[PDB]
Amino acid sequence: NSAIYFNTSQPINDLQGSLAAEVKFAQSQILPAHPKEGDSQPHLTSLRKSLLLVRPVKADDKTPVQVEARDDNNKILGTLTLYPPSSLPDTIYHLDGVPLENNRITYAQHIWSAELPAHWIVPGLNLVIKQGNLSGRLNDIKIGAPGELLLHTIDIGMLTTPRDRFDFAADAAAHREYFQTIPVSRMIVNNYAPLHLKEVMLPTGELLTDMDPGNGGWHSGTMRQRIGKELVSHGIDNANYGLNSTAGLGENSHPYVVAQLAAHNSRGNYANGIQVHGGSGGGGIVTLDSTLGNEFSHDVGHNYGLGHYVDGFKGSVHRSAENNNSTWGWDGDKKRFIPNFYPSQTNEKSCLNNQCQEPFDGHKFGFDAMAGGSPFSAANRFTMYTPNSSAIIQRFFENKAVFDSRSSTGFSKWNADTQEMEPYEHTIEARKPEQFGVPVTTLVGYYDPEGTLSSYIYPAMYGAYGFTYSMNKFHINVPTESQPLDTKSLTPAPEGLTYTVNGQALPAKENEGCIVSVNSGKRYCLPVGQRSGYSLPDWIVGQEVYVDSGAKAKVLLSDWDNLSYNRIGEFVGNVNPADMKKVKAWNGQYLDFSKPRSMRVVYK
Numbered sequence: 001n002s003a004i005y006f007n008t009s010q011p012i013n014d015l016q017g018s019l020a021a022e023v024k025f026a027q028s029q030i031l032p033a034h035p036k037e038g039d040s041q042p043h044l045t046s047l048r049k050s051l052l053l054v055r056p057v058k059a060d061d062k063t064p065v066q067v068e069a070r071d072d073n074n075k076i077l078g079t080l081t082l083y084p085p086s087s088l089p090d091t092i093y094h095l096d097g098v099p100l101e102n103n104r105i106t107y108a109q110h111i112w113s114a115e116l117p118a119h120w121i122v123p124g125l126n127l128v129i130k131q132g133n134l135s136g137r138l139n140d141i142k143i144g145a146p147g148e149l150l151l152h153t154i155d156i157g158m159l160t161t162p163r164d165r166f167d168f169a170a171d172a173a174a175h176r177e178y179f180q181t182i183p184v185s186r187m188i189v190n191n192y193a194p195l196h197l198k199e200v201m202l203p204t205g206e207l208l209t210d211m212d213p214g215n216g217g218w219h220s221g222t223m224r225q226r227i228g229k230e231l232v233s234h235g236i237d238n239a240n241y242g243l244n245s246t247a248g249l250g251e252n253s254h255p256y257v258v259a260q261l262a263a264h265n266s267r268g269n270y271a272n273g274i275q276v277h278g279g280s281g282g283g284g285i286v287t288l289d290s291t292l293g294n295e296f297s298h299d300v301g302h303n304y305g306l307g308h309y310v311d312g313f314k315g316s317v318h319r320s321a322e323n324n325n326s327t328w329g330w331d332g333d334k335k336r337f338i339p340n341f342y343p344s345q346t347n348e349k350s351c352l353n354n355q356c357q358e359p360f361d362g363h364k365f366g367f368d369a370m371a372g373g374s375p376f377s378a379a380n381r382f383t384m385y386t387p388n389s390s391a392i393i394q395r396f397f398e399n400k401a402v403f404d405s406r407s408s409t410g411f412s413k414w415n416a417d418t419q420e421m422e423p424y425e426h427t428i429e430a431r432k433p434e435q436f437g438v439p440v441t442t443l444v445g446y447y448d449p450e451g452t453l454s455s456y457i458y459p460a461m462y463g464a465y466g467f468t469y470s471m472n473k474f475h476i477n478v479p480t481e482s483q484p485l486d487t488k489s490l491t492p493a494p495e496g497l498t499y500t501v502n503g504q505a506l507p508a509k510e511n512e513g514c515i516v517s518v519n520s521g522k523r524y525c526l527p528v529g530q531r532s533g534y535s536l537p538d539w540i541v542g543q544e545v546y547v548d549s550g551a552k553a554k555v556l557l558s559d560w561d562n563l564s565y566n567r568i569g570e571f572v573g574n575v576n577p578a579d580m581k582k583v584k585a586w587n588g589q590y591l592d593f594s595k596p597r598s599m600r601v602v603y604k
């Protein structure tokens, strides 16, 4: 017994030409080239590596399939030679050993595949697919904004020590696992040092010690709101926006211009004991008890503009291929599909408001993460969003501005009319960061502007990545590099504060020059006036790389160890591997610098 195919649906042609083929892309999920009538699916997100699935209407698993990609200007981007149906990526339930029958599962039969680089996924992209003498064109590809998510993590102890159970924050792989489920180009997970509050001061001017006089719970308690949410979370969000002061009561003062969320763990001593907070999110905040699984995907989901049971059954239940709201996930690092069903054969149906989705070969179909869904396996510790929710999440990111160090305003926002990221003016009067994603010391507390009395500065909060600038609530970001009716001596920041970047690597700064791994996105940066050691670090040597040079900088590369034999190539701006292969060197010849061995960063 062998081969159990998920998608047995009749392929519909998506091309204009000789070749009849169905086309699918795959980022945070498998998405169609042409969505069916009444189906809600996300479209391609700009600047994110995409799988390309080609299913010829008239099957041919033998004749080589090729893809020629062209940009808006009709310049050939590249040519790919697809993998035969036999080489189609497996499920994450597959095991290595040739004769636990999940290994039989395969997405579909007769599907050809390739990987389209991130820099191709930009509005204007057109494909020409050829299968021998046959050819077809896909020239109406919808590509959305390169969406961004900035997520802060802090563990708050309120009249107690921090819980120390923020699994997500302590696990880099979880940041990566979550990135696979959402339709963004870039995700930054910023670590804040845990906050310990032995005393708690309220905007009413009431100092607490020992316990909050009211009751607390999962969704309640005064501290949970005033401190956990407004002071800490909206404090971190507001400081990054440059707002020096806001009211000590309320959430409306938060501008929420960028998709910036401050996720926390909060527990405090109340008049009914130590109460752990959780189960909520919105307006740039996340109150998490469980930081992995459904609670994370739901709470964060709320920040994307989502409610509960989005669009009833049609929108909330994961479906088989003959239906709408049907898809499978994609793990772009593992190079494997994430099926929308549990690995166990329980023969259970998935129902909502009486409607049901029948199981796939015994496997129970999942659930949106705003309708009580849960991860399928430890392969991805997060809940898969249904195509309907994923489409809403995508629209949400596209409509948000982005912190952008290369922008004249420090911000960029998508122009749906010109199909490009354009500068966005942030208003406090114009407000622009002096420093971008630098370590930060977030100073926080309350002050009485009229006086008489009770102004209180809280202990300094320390972040790995933030933005710096030149009763009421104060929230100011100071660069940690500086070293730090009330006065308080500020403790220096602890050591190991680190942020994570998933997807698109961060851009090179003004007087900086990088080479970046096409695979991992891990950068090797040097400032202007600096060179590498004798040879580049072992990790980057032999790797497929792109150059990212700052406005005031120039990148010098050699294909030899030490910038030797005058075999130096000059790279300015953003240069891709294909444009690193025939570059004129200082020694008057054209050389390949696609696998460099030494580097130097100069001005100009």
Ligand SMILES: [Zn+2]
Pocket: 298, 302, 307, 308
């Ligand atoms: Zn909810």
